[PDB]
Symmetry: T
Subunit: 150 residues, 12 copies
Amino acid sequence: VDTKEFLNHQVANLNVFTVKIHQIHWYMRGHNFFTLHEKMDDLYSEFGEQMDEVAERLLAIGGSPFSTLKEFLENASVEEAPYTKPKTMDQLMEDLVGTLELLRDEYKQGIELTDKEGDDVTNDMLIAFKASIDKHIWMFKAFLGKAPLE
Amino acid sequence: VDTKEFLNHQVANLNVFTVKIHQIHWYMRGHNFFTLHEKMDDLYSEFGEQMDEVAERLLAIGGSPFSTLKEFLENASVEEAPYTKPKTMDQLMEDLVGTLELLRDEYKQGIELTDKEGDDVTNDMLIAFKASIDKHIWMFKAFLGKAPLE
Amino acid sequence: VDTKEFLNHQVANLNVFTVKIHQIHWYMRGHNFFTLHEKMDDLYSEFGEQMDEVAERLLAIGGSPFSTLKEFLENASVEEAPYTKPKTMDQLMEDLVGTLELLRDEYKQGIELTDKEGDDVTNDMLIAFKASIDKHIWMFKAFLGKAPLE
Amino acid sequence: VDTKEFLNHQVANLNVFTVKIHQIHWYMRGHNFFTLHEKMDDLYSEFGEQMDEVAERLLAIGGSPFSTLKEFLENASVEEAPYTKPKTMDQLMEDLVGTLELLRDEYKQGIELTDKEGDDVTNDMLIAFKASIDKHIWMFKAFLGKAPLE
Amino acid sequence: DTKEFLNHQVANLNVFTVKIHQIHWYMRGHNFFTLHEKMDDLYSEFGEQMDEVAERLLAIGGSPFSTLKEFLENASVEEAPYKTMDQLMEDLVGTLELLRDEYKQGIELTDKEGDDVTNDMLIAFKASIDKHIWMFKAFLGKAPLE
Amino acid sequence: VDTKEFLNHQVANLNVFTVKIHQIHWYMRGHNFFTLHEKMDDLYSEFGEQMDEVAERLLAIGGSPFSTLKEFLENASVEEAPYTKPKTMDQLMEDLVGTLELLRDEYKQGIELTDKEGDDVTNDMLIAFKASIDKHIWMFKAFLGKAPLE
Amino acid sequence: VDTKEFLNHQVANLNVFTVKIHQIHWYMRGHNFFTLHEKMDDLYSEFGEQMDEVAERLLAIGGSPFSTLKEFLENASVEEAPYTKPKTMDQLMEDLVGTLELLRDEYKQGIELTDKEGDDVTNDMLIAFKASIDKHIWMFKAFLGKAPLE
Amino acid sequence: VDTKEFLNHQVANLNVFTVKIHQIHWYMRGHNFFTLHEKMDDLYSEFGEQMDEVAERLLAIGGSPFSTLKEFLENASVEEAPYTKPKTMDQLMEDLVGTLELLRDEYKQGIELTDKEGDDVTNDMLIAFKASIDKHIWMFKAFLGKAPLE
Amino acid sequence: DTKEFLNHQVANLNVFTVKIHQIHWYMRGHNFFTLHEKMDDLYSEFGEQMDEVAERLLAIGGSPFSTLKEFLENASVEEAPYKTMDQLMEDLVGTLELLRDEYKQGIELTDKEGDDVTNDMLIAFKASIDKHIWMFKAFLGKAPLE
Amino acid sequence: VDTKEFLNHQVANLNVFTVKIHQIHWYMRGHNFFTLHEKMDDLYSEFGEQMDEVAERLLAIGGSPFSTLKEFLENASVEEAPYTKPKTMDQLMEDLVGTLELLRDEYKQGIELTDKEGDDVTNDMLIAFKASIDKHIWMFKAFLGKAPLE
Amino acid sequence: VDTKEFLNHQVANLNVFTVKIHQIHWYMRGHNFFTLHEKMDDLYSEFGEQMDEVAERLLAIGGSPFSTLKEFLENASVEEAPYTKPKTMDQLMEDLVGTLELLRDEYKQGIELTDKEGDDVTNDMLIAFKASIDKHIWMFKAFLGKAPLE
Amino acid sequence: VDTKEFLNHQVANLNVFTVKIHQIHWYMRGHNFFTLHEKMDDLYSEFGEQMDEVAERLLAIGGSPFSTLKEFLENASVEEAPYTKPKTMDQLMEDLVGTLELLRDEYKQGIELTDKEGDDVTNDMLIAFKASIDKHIWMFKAFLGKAPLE
Ligand SMILES: [Zn+2]
Ligand SMILES: [Zn+2]
Ligand SMILES: [Zn+2]
Ligand SMILES: [Zn+2]
Ligand SMILES: [Zn+2]
Ligand SMILES: [Zn+2]
Ligand SMILES: [Zn+2]
Ligand SMILES: [Zn+2]
Ligand SMILES: [Zn+2]
Ligand SMILES: [Zn+2]
Ligand SMILES: [Zn+2]
Ligand SMILES: [Zn+2]
Ligand SMILES: [Zn+2]
Ligand SMILES: [Zn+2]
Ligand SMILES: [Zn+2]
Ligand SMILES: [Zn+2]
Ligand SMILES: [Zn+2]
Ligand SMILES: [Zn+2]
Ligand SMILES: [Zn+2]
Ligand SMILES: [Zn+2]
Ligand SMILES: [Zn+2]
Ligand SMILES: [Zn+2]
Ligand SMILES: [Zn+2]
Ligand SMILES: [Zn+2]
Ligand SMILES: [Zn+2]
Ligand SMILES: [Zn+2]
Ligand SMILES: [Zn+2]
Ligand SMILES: [Zn+2]
Ligand SMILES: [Zn+2]
Ligand SMILES: [Zn+2]
Ligand SMILES: [Zn+2]
Ligand SMILES: [Zn+2]
Ligand SMILES: [Zn+2]
Ligand SMILES: [Zn+2]
Ligand SMILES: [Zn+2]
Ligand SMILES: [Zn+2]
Ligand SMILES: [Zn+2]
Ligand SMILES: [Zn+2]
Ligand SMILES: [Zn+2]
Ligand SMILES: [Zn+2]
Ligand SMILES: [Zn+2]
Ligand SMILES: [Zn+2]
C-alpha cells in the first residue's frame, strides 16, 4: 500500500459515501427532517469536493484514479445497503457517524503513509480533510447525545 | 414500464453519467484541456441536480429511489468502461455525446409515458431536462465539427 | 366552470392559505420552533407570489380578480378556524398538509380544465405550481413520520 | 382600549390595507401605470412587514393576534370595497391616501396610549411606522397636486 | 413545419428588437424616463427570446436567418421609418399581439409534430407576451383583449 | 445610581452573557443541536454588538467602561457556573431565557432611569435592545413549549 | 480667465446647481412626482461628484478652491431664487434645463480655454462632464416634449 | 421658535456644515491626510443624508424648507470662514468638533421643543441624529487627545 | 457632417451585431465554447456602442435610422447569408478594421467641427476596436497590422 | 501536560486577550485613533475566531473547554490590568505586541508538543494561527518604529 | 522618438516603479504604517494595470514590448536603489513622489508626441494616466505637508 | 542556505517568473489565444501573491527581501530570454512548464530545509504553494499531451 493506491482507495470510498449521503437525504423522516435534509446537501457538496481533490492529487503525482461505479464498489471499504425497512433519524445518523469514523481512521493511516513516502502535499491535504471529519463527528455525535470519542 | 420505474431508471443512468463526466474531467489531454476540463465541471453539477430532482420527484409520487451503487449498476442502461487505453479528446467527447443522445431518446420515451399516464408535473420536468440535453448535444457536436443530428 | 372562474377561485384560496400560514407562523410552539417558524416565512412568500401570479394571469386573459377579504371568504374552499386552544406542532403541520393536498387536488382540476379549453399558458402555470406543492407535501409528511400519499 | 387590543386592531387594519394595495396594484390603468404598479409592490412589502412586526410584538407581550380573514373583517376600521365600476388613478390614490391618513391618526392614538401604559418598546415601534406613513402621505399628496395636510 | 416556424420568428424578433430601439430613441413626453428604461428591459428580454429561438432551431437541425436581408424577406412584423407616447405604445402592443397569435400557431404546430421542447419554449414566451399585453394596454387605458 | 453607573453595569452583564452563550454553544447536545448551535452564534454576535455599543455610548457621555474579566465578575448581576455535570438543551435554554429575562427587567429600569435624567440617546438605545430581547424571550419560550410571560 | 479660475467658477456653479436640484426635489408636485423625485436624487449625486472632482483637479494644478457658501454666491453665474410662488413640474424642469444649458455653454468655453493653455487633463475631464450634460439636456427636453436644441 | 422653524434652521446649518466638511476634505495636510481625507467623505455623505431627511420631515409636517444658498447663510448659526493661512490637522479638527458640539446642543433644544409640541416622529428623528453626533464627538476628541466633554 | 457620420455608424453597427450573431450561431470546431461565449461579449459591447452612438446623435439634434430598411441602405458594412472558425474570424477582423478606419474619419471630422464630446466618444470606441483587432489577429496567427 | 490541557489553556488566554483588545479599542487616543480603532475590531474578530476554533477542536478530541470568566482568570498566563491612569497608543500597542509575542511563544510550544503526540490536525491549526500572529507582530512593531525581533 | 519607443520606455519605467512600490510596501516603518502599507497595495495594482495597458496598446499599434527584467533595467529612466539603511516614512514618500513627478513629466512628453503623430487613442490613454498621477502627487505632497507643485 | 536566504532566493525567482508570464501573455499567438491569454492573468495574480507572501514571511522572521530588479537578476535561478524569434504556443507552454518544475523542486528543497531548521510556519507556507504548482504542472502537461511526470 503506497500513496497512489491509498488515494485511489479513498476515491472509491468517497463515491460510496456521497451516494449514502443522498440515501439519508432522500429517505429521512421525523421532527428533524428540515434541518438534517439541508445538512445532508452540505455534506454531499463538501465530500463530493474532497473526492475531486483527492482524485486530482492522485493525477498530479502520476496516478490513475478509478472512474467507474464498478471500480468504486470493488475497491471501497465503505459499506452500503439498500433502503428497505424504515429507519429512525438516530439510526441513519449512526450509519453516517460510523462511516465518518471509518474515513477518519483511514485518513490517519494515509497521513502516516504519506509521512513515510515524504509526500508533504498529500500529507497536508489529508490533515485538512481530517479536521473537517473530526468536527462533523463531534457535531453529529452531539446530535445523538454522545461524546465524540464515545 | 410506469412513471415510478422510469424515474428510478434515470436515477441510475444519471449516477453513471456523472461518474463518466468525472472520468472525462480527469483523463482528458490535448490543446483543449482547459476549456473542456471546466466545461465538465458545469455538466457534473447540472446533471447532479437533475438526478436529485428526479429522485425527489419520485419520492413525491410515492416511489423509492435507488440509493446504492449496486442498485445503479444493475438498472442503468448507460454503459461505463474503466480507463485503460489512452483516448483522445475527440473520443471522450464522442462517448459523452453518445450518452447524451441516449438520455435524450430515453427521456423522449418518458415524456410520452407520462403524458399517457396523466402525470403532468413529471412530464413537464422531463421536457425541461430534455431542452438542456438538446442544447448540450448541439454544442458538443459543433465542438466535434458535426451537426446536432449527425 | 371555465378558466377565469377557476383562477379567481384560487385567488381566494391562496389569500386564505397565506393567512393560515401566518397563524401557524405566529402561534407555533415546541422544539422545532426555530426551523418551522422560518419555514413558514418561506411558504408565505412563495404562495403570496403564486397568488399575485394567478391574479395577474386572470387579468391577462380578460378576467377580474377578487380584491377584498369579503370576496376571499365568500369564495374560498380553503377553510380557516380562529386560534383558541393551544395546538401542538404536529396539529399545525397536519392542517398545513391538508390545505396543500386541497390545493394540489384543485390544481389537478384546473390543469385538466385548462388543457381542454386550450389555455396552454395557464395550464403550464398551474403545473409548475403543482410541482412545488407536491414537493412540500412530501417534505412535510416526512416531518410527520408519514409517507407522501399516506 | 389597552395596548394588546390596539395592536390586534392594527393587525386587522394592515391585512385589509395590504389587500387594498393589491387591488390598486391589479386594477390601475393610465399613463402612470408602470411607476405606480411597481410602487404598490413596495407598499405591499413594507406594510406586510409592519403587520408581521405588530403581530409578533403583540405575541411578545402576551397577546394573541387575529389570524383569520373572519377576525380581520370583524375588527378592522379600515374599509374595503369590491371593484365593480371603473376608477381613475387619482381616485385610487385618493383611496390610498385616505387609508394612510386613517392609519396615521390611529397610530397617534396608540402612541399616546402606549406612553400612558408605559410600554416603551411598542411606543417606539409605532413612532417609526408613523414616520414612514407621514412620508408616504407627503409623497402621494404631492402626486395628487396637494400639500401634505390639505 | 417547426423549422420553418422558428426561422420565421428569428426574422420577426430581429425586426421587433429594432422597433423597440426605435421607441426607445424617439419617445417624448411625461413618461419618457419610465418608458425609456422599460424599452431597455424589453430589448434584453426579446433579444434573449431571439437567441433562444435561433439556438433551438440549431438544436433540431435547422439553419437560422442571420442577415438583415433575410429578416426583411421573411418577417411578418412590420416596420416604418420615423410620434406621441400613445402612438408608439399602440405600435408596440400591436406587434406583441401579432407575436402572441403567431406563437399560438407554433404551439399547436409543435404539439402535432411531437416537439415537446419547442412547444414548451413557445408557451413560456407567450406567458410573458400576455403579461406585457395586459400592462401596456392598461397604460393606454384599455382592457387586455380590447 | 445614574446613567454612567447603569451602562457600566450592563457592560459587565453582557461580557458574562456572551461567555455563557459560548458555554451553551459548546456543550449543547440533543436532536436540536444543529439549529441551536447556529442560533447561539447569532446571539453571541448580537449581544457582543450590544456590549460594544453600550461601552461606546458610556464613553460618549464621559464615562469609563470596565475592561477586564476581574471587573466584570465583581460587578455583574448575571451569574455563571462552571460546567461540571451534563445538562440538557432545555436546561441550557432555561438558563438562557432566565438571563434574558434578567436583562429585560434591568433594561426596563435603565429605560425609565434614562428618560428620567433626560438622556434621550441612551434611552432610545436601550429601548431598541429591549425590543430584541423581548422577541428572543418569546421565541425561546415557544421553543420550550411555554408562553412568553408564563 | 485662466484654467484655475474657470475650475473655481464651476465649483461655485455646481454648488448652486445641487442646491437647486434639492429645491426641485423637495417642492415638485404633480402626476410625475415619483419618477422625477428619484431622478433628482441621481442628478444631485452625479453633480456632487463633478464638483468634488473639479475642486480636486484645481488642487492638483496648484489652485485653491472656494470652500464657503459666501464665496459660492459671489462667484457663481448660476442663479437661484427662493421658492414662494408655487411652480409647476414643467417650470421646475424648464429651470433645470436652463441651468444645464448654461453649464454646457460655460464648459464649452472651458474646453477651448484648456486646449489653448495646453492642460490636457483638465480638457479631457471637462469633455467627459459635458458628454453627461448633453445627455441630460436631451432627456429632460424629451420629458418636456421638446427637442434637445430647442 | 416652533418645530417647523427649528427644522428649517437645521436645514441651513447642515448645508453650511457639509461645505465646511468639503473645505477640510480639500485643504488638509499632514501625516493623517489619507485617513482623515476619506473620513471627511463619510461625514459629508452622512450629514448630507441628515439634511435631506430633515428637509423632508419638514415637508411632511406642512413646512417649506429653505432651498437657496442665500437662505442658508442668512439663517444658519453654523459659522464658516474662507481658507486663507495654512492650518494644522489639529486646528481643522477642532473647527469640526466645535461645529459638532453646536449641532448637538441645538439638537438637544429641538428634542425638548418637539417633546413640547407632541411631535413624536421629529423627536425620534433628532435623537437618532444626536446619537451619531455624540459618537463622532467622542472619536474626534479622542483623535485630539481629549475626552468627549472636555 | 457629424450627424451624417453618426447615423452612418448606427447602420454599420446594426449590421455588425447581426453578423456577430451569425458567427455566434454557426461556428464549429475545437474553439466553439470559447468563441461562442466571446461573441456574446462582443454583441453586448457593440450593441452598447450602437446605443451610445444613436443617443449622441439625438443629443446633437439628429434623427437615428431605426429600421432594417434604413440600415441596409446606408451601411458600408457587408453581410452575406450562410464555415470554418478561421473564415468567420477573418470576416470579423475585416469588419473591425473597416469600423476602425471609418471611426478615424469621424474623429478628424469631429475635431474640425469642434464637437469634442463626439470626438472623445469615437476615440474610446477605437481604443477597444484596436485591442480586439490585435487579439483576433493573434488568434489567426497574424500580427495586428498584418 | 498534553494537547487537551494546552488547548484549554489557550481558550483562557484568548478570552483574556479579546477583552484586552476591547480595552485598547475603547480607551485609545491620539492621531492614529481612526486607523487603530478599526484595526482593533479586526483583531477582536480574528482572535475571537481562534478562540472558538480552539474550543471546538478541544471538543472534537474529547476535551471540555473552560466556559466561565472565573475559569479564564484562574488559568490564563495572559495578564490584564484595569484602566486607572491614562496611557498612549504606543503603550497600548506595546502591551498588545507583548501579548502577541506571548501567544507566539506559547503556540510554538503547542506546535512541537502536538506534532510530538501525533495530533496532526491540532498541529496544523496552531501553525496557521502562528502564521497570522507572526504577521501581526511584524506589522505592529513596524508601527512602533521597531524591527520584528528587535 | 516615435510612439512605439515612448510606450516601450514606459513599460520599463512602470516595472521599475511597481517594484519600488513593493520596496516601500515591505520596508516602511512608523506611525502611518497601516494606512500607507495598504495604500501601496492600491498603487501596485493601479500601475501594474497601467503597465499591462501600455504594453497591450504597444502591441495594438504593431510594437513589441520589453518582456524581461534585463530589458527593463536597460531602458528605464526610473531609478532604483537597494534598501540598506533604515529610511523614514517621509523619505520613502519623497522617493515615491519623485518617481511620480518623473512619470508625469515623461507622460507630458508622450502626450505632445502622440498628438503630433495623430495617435489619438494613445494620446487619450496617456492623458487618463496623467490625471491619476496628478491626483496622487497632490495627495502625497499634502501628506508631506507641502503643496502639489512645491 | 538557511531559511532567510532561501525565501529571498524565491522572492527573486517569482519576480522573474511573473514577468515571464506577462511575456507569454503578450506574445502568444494561435487558436488557443483567448483561453491561455486569460489563463496567464490568473497565473500572474496567483504567483504575484505568492511573491508578496514570501517576502512578508521573510520580513516576519527578521529578513530583508530583495527589492530591485538588479537584486532579482543577480539572485534568480529562474531564467528569462527576450522575445526575438517567433515561438509557438506549445513552446511557450513548455517554457512555462519548465519554470513550474524548477519552482517545485526548489520548493521541495526549502520544505526539507525548513523542517530541519524547525520553522513550522514557513514549512507549511511552502507546502501550500507546492500543492498549487503540482496542480498547474498536471494541467499544463495535459495541455501538452503528456503525463505530469513525463
Ligand atoms: Zn475537478
Ligand atoms: Zn502541514
Ligand atoms: Zn490544437
Ligand atoms: Zn480541476
Ligand atoms: Zn468536479
Ligand atoms: Zn435534494
Ligand atoms: Zn431537497
Ligand atoms: Zn420572526
Ligand atoms: Zn404583482
Ligand atoms: Zn400622461
Ligand atoms: Zn406585477
Ligand atoms: Zn414573522
Ligand atoms: Zn402627463
Ligand atoms: Zn447565444
Ligand atoms: Zn448559446
Ligand atoms: Zn408544458
Ligand atoms: Zn414549462
Ligand atoms: Zn461551530
Ligand atoms: Zn467598537
Ligand atoms: Zn423621549
Ligand atoms: Zn427610536
Ligand atoms: Zn398626468
Ligand atoms: Zn425622498
Ligand atoms: Zn437627496
Ligand atoms: Zn473628494
Ligand atoms: Zn478625494
Ligand atoms: Zn430626498
Ligand atoms: Zn423614541
Ligand atoms: Zn484544434
Ligand atoms: Zn439607450
Ligand atoms: Zn438612454
Ligand atoms: Zn480626448
Ligand atoms: Zn476621454
Ligand atoms: Zn467603534
Ligand atoms: Zn462556534
Ligand atoms: Zn506532519
Ligand atoms: Zn496546512
Ligand atoms: Zn500585508
Ligand atoms: Zn493583459
Ligand atoms: Zn485550432
Ligand atoms: Zn489582456
Ligand atoms: Zn503585501
